[PDB]
Amino acid sequence: EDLCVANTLFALNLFKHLAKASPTQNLFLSPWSISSTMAMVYMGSRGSTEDQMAKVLQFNEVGAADKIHSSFRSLSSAINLLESVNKLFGEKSASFREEYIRLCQKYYSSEPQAVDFLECAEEARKKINSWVKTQTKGKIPNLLPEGSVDGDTRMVLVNAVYFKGKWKTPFEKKLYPFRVNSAQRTPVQMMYLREKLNIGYIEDLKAQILELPYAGDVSMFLLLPDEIADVSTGLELLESEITYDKLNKWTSKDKMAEDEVEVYIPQFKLEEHYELRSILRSMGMEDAFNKGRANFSGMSERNDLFLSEVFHQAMVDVNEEGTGPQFVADHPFLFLIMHKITNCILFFGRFSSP
């Protein structure tokens, strides 16, 4: 029983499926905002659409229908730089119920907006992009592109999230060769820090795990292969073996002990944009995206409403500003950003290519 447990299950499954589409390049997303915005769409869903969303969101694996939405509103209070903006746009002839709009306000503080996809889809496309550009203060001027919506579009969800924390201890700004793959290296600016930090070693996968705290009890956990068993990113084994139970154990206080570590990590910025429909359908959320089967009767009395697409943008800025074992991240790693009090994964990513 825990939305943050479901979120982690879902985040790892989403990352695995996403990694079929992008097996080596930089990958960065916020499982928590996808879970929360997809839960609001699931609030509007019924029948086998609902059943499938609940299963892919892992709500069923952690066991509580009438408590999900209020738990998301409570969690959002505990969790809440961390900026998250979202909006559900829907074709105006499939009118949202007054009551759905009221529940969106109440549980997700989000208001669905009607657009005219059926007759002026390009204009709708451009109104979605002005709202996004406006709410993200210029970082994303054109979230949706040229032909991502047309007369067949019925409903799209947009979600853009940005994170930049303040490290508990400032790094020192040291170009080092970062290894992208067995034939290619790219110079990166490295940041260095010597500090008492929790660090662990995963014996079976020959990798180090380190926690880098930010101020308010939000930490970055970084998983960095030690032996390199593939000629590509070197992440192949960590990515086929990570599981909920394994991550839990790797991050347990018995497996991660405090120690004076010298840390070298690149200065980096990631911005990745996704269209998750094909990813979510491969995970099992099929009916929500299928015009002949979707059931959004909770959102609208009109029969003709299905989910056309999910736009997700996530961005992180990692720099030196803050308030014995060696961890040298001069080759690819997985990382996650964790809300320690809730144990919610806010972001999850692969840094492979500077």
67 and 10 within one domain = yes
Which of these, 107, 100, 60, 45, lies nearest to 307 by C-alpha position? 45
142 and 81 within one domain = yes
160 and 102 within one domain = yes
Question: Do 101 and 87 meet the contact criterion of CB atoms below 8 Å apart?
Answer: no
Cα–Cα distance, 88 to 155 (Å, whole number): 7
User: What φ, ψ does residue 173 adopt, rounded to 5°?
Assistant: -75, 110
Per-residue b/e over 145-162, b at no fewer than 16 CB within 10 Å? eeebbeeebbbbbbbbbb
The enclosing domain of 27 has a CATH number of 3.30.497.10
203 and 106 within one domain = no
149 and 199 within one domain = no
Amino acid making up residue 117: F
On the 0-12 / 13-18 / 19+ scale of CB atoms within 10 A, 262 is middle
DSSP 44: T
22 and 141 within one domain = yes
Cα–Cα distance, 43 to 90 (Å, whole number): 15
Give the technique used to solve this structure.
Answer: X-ray
Question: Which tokens hold the place of 132?
Answer: 């996004």
Cα–Cα distance, 354 to 351 (Å, whole number): 8
105 and 57 within one domain = yes
DSSP 162: E
303 and 240 within one domain = no
108 and 237 within one domain = no
Q: Domain total for the chain?
A: 2
227 and 276 within one domain = no
Question: Which tokens hold the place of 127?
Answer: 């109104």
**143 in helix, strand or coil?**
coil
144 and 58 within one domain = yes
Domain interval for residue 248: 167-265+324-350
The enclosing domain of 217 has a CATH number of 2.30.39.10
DSSP labels, 263-321? EEEE-EEEEEEEE-HHHHHHTT--GGG-TTT---TTT-S-S-----EEEEEEEEEE-S-
312 and 201 within one domain = no
Per-residue b/e over 47-73, b at no fewer than 16 CB within 10 Å? eebbebbbebbbbeebeeeeebbebbe
Please state, in angstroms and as integers, the Cα–Cα distance from residue 269 to each residue in 18, 144, 327, 336, following that order. Answer: 20, 21, 20, 14
